[PDB]
Amino acid sequence: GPHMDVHKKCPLCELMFPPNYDQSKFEEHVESHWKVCPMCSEQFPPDYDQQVFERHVQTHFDQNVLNFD
Ligand SMILES: [Zn+2]
Ligand SMILES: [Zn+2]
Numbered sequence: 001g002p003h004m005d006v007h008k009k010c011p012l013c014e015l016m017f018p019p020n021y022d023q024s025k026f027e028e029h030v031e032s033h034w035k036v037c038p039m040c041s042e043q044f045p046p047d048y049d050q051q052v053f054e055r056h057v058q059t060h061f062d063q064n065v066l067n068f069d
Pocket of ligand 2: 037039040056057060
């Protein structure tokens, strides 16, 4: 950390943490913004659209109407 080590902010929502905050706890928070499809276990970038993500997740519920096969 430099003279300004208050850069520990989630660049995705700008939640600002103290300089002494856990890097990995920071990263998991960044990875929380990476929207994870529970059915893909894939994390989608913050650059991804929530609308697109929600429709993506919806298609996992849609399942192309899995009737049997
Ligand atoms: Zn955040
Ligand atoms: Zn998915």
